[PDB]
Amino acid sequence: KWTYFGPDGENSWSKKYPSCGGLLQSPIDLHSDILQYDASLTPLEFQGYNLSANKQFLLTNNGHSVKLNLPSDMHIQGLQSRYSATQLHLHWGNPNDPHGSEHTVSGQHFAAELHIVHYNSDLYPDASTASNKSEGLAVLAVLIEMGSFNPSYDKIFSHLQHVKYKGQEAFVPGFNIEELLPERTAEYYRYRGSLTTPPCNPTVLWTVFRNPVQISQEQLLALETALYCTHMDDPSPREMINNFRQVQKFDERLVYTSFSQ
Amino acid sequence: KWTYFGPDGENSWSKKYPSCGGLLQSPIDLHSDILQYDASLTPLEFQGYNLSANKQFLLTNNGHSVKLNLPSDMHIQGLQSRYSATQLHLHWGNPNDPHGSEHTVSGQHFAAELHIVHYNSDLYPDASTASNKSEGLAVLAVLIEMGSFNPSYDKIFSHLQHVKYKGQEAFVPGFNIEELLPERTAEYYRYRGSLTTPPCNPTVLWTVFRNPVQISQEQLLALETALYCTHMDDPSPREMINNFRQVQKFDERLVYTSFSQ
Ligand SMILES: COC(=O)c1cc(S(N)(=O)=O)c(Cl)cc1SC1CCCCC1
Ligand SMILES: COC(=O)c1cc(S(N)(=O)=O)c(Cl)cc1SC1CCCCC1
Ligand SMILES: [Zn+2]
Ligand SMILES: [Zn+2]
After folding, report:
1. For testing contact with chain B, the best of A13, A14, A97 (most B CBs within 10 A)
2. Where is the active site (chains A, B)?
């Protein structure tokens, strides 16, 4: 039901989803006053990200984003439990304003944002169970700027016309998900926060990479014009655009950085 | 009951104040891509701003800001209707993150923000009646940054000691409120928006001056540290900090400017 625009938009989410008005909300603006270097933030290792090109993975329009299902053998090594992948998805703006990242850096939006959602598979048997438990989820966020054409992101974007409407599903051949990450993944921001969508559970360990990746203007325009929040037969179609939450107050949180300067 | 933090903070305002989740919400980021010069935007005239030094004006801590009551002979000339003053108040951050303006410019907060609230006295008998009506309110916003000591702002800040707690009141002798305005008041941003606090009625014509004023490090710290949201005999005192709303989405809309250069 919830949306990003109009009466069911973000200032109203808390009416139906109490955690959206709770503590530890994401996303946030990353700026100097709230950053602090933490030398304990060692490099993550990305295991099983190189999905077999002979296997296929389900892409689905869920009414709010486009998501790709990921296999539980794919995981992050380096956190205090193993976190296994469950899905990736994006957030973006619109053709006339391609500035739809969720996190901002010193007050500025990037064009888009990729989230790769993982869950604590050591403790929980699936991501839904994990999603309402403390530090049950770990999301990796990649900031996306308008730049060069990106063939790795196009392995997703080339299938958008086959998931235009809510409920639609398509198969994507496997590819190396690490190709979606930026340079120098050892440099990141780390903070305790929440799902950026209803039900906004405050159960996410966030890692936002310091460096953005680039996709082209034409890739952003495809992403911003391919998809609808509504079903194929809905008489009141709604374009899937501007699907990012505004930044949240940082109720006395610090953001820890793995880089000093 | 509403606050800027915890369960009753800004994401939950729309439960009891539905307009907080409606159209035309303020504040917004004033950024270059949405600015448009409008030659119709002529200089306002500030009439009756030189308050009789022989009258006294009520300063209150209302639990959300510090407000000074203003007299209805003080008014703006230059708009469609006369808008008569009713009150002024401020918004600020906190000493660890001293960047608590409501409006932002190109994504950047200023240290604080002063609002001089006026109502349409040609159409309505008083500010309360005007506040939920068409063309009801006009607010002048001054952005504040740290710099040199500002004697005129000290005409308010010297009384903060006396209104530390919710409910408390002091009297301030009349002074020239135009002294709180920045240089080159002819230069401003103008847009239709809302109260930035509950009930968030979309009835405000905003005028945000282009140029900030300065107050000293000591004055900004006094403002951030002088006040509490709670009553004097509350066993759980809360400091009055970070009393600004996050910026709202503003799509397919312009902010008009009285300046091009
Ligand atoms: C429309 O987006 C979602 O619904 C969704 C978004 C995020 S985000 N944007 O990365 O904070 C996360 Cl961590 C989980 C979910 S859904 C969650 C996925 C794990 C299983 C439980 C449902
Ligand atoms: C705590 O701040 C307020 O309550 C308040 C704030 C604003 S703002 N921040 O300038 O948008 C305005 Cl326009 C009116 C009011 S109260 C309004 C004053 C006119 C009579 C009705 C009540
Ligand atoms: Zn997301
Ligand atoms: Zn105000």
Report:
1. A14
2. 64
